Paper text:
Here we present rotamer inverted fragment finder–diffusion (Riff-Diff), a hybrid machine learning and atomistic modelling strategy for scaffolding catalytic arrays in de novo proteins. We highlight the general applicability of Riff-Diff by designing enzymes for two mechanistically distinct chemical transformations, the retro-aldol reaction and the Morita–Baylis–Hillman reaction. We show that in both cases, it is possible to generate catalysts that exhibit activities rivalling those optimized by in vitro evolution, along with exquisite stereoselectivity. High-resolution structures of six of the designs revealed near-atomic active site design precision.
We obtained crystal structures of the four designs: RAD13 (kcat = 3.8 × 10−5 s−1), RAD17 (kcat not determined), RAD32 (kcat = 1.1 × 10−2 s−1), and RAD36 (kcat = 6.2 × 10−5 s−1). The crystal structures agree with the design models, having backbone Cα RMSD values between 0.68 Å and 1.2 Å. By contrast, in the active site of RAD32, the most active design for which an experimental structure could be obtained, a tyrosine of the catalytic tetrad (Tyr120) adopts a catalytically unproductive conformation. Another tyrosine, Tyr99, is positioned to compensate for this interaction, and a tenfold lower kcat of a Y99F variant confirmed its participation in the catalytic machinery. However, the exchange Y120F also led to a tenfold reduction in activity. The observed alternative conformation of Y120 concomitant with the reduced activity of Y120F hints at a potential conformational change induced by substrate binding.
Numbering used by the authors: 2 to 200
The structure:
């Protein structure tokens, strides 16, 4: 809190630099998830337990965009439970980010398409905020989840309007991301997150 004001401010000025990498990464994850969908629950759990960021990022989008089809409560529960289970700080924060997007929509009553352009706006500002605070030693592996959510809600509270590139990229990638969250049911996602925690 407060100690990240210049980190977010500089993050909003460079947010559009992360638009193209996000689009490329999302298109790659859309094909890689099919390999791990055929691999099964045990293949996803073992990969994440051994610190595979890519598989963990695949699972995050699988949980978040599965909530687009309904029952966003369960996606919030799984994203927060997975955040505590994993040890990496970057994906800990990404899991909390997707949970806060769904939590903010339910508490405010915002529909998915009304808030879709703000997904990439929060991602492209919060990610350089994390890197800046990590480069300054403000956040670390011992940083509690409660302080990570304070960073996310601080960016989401002072969230600027989406940029032209973000609105453009949102239309390009939303159909891709929604198909990514159609393979793994909430029951399978429950098994994966439970497998990461104690499997």
């Amino acid at each position: 809190l407060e100690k990240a004001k210049e980190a977010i401010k500089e993050a909003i000025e460079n947010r559009d630099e992360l638009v193209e990498p996000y689009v490329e990464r999302a298109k790659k994850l859309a094909e890689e998830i099919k390999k791990y969908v055929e691999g099964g629950v045990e293949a996803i759990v073992e990969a994440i337990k051994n610190g595979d960021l890519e598989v963990l990022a695949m699972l995050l989008k699988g949980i978040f965009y599965h909530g687009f089809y309904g029952e966003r409560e369960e996606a919030i529960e799984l994203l927060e439970k997975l955040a505590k289970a994993v040890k990496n700080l970057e994906q800990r924060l990404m899991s909390l980010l997707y949970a806060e997007l769904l939590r903010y929509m339910e508490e405010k009553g915002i529909s998915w398409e009304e808030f879709a352009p703000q997904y990439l706006t929060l991602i492209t500002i919060l990610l350089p905020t994390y890197e800046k605070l990590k480069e300054a030693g403000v956040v670390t592996e011992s940083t509690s989840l409660e302080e990570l959510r304070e960073i996310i809600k601080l960016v989401l509270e002072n969230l600027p309007e989406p940029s032209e590139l973000e609105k453009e990229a949102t239309k390009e990638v939303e159909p891709i991301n929604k198909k990514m969250g159609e393979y793994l049911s909430f029951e399978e996602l429950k098994e994966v997150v439970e497998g990461v925690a104690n499997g």
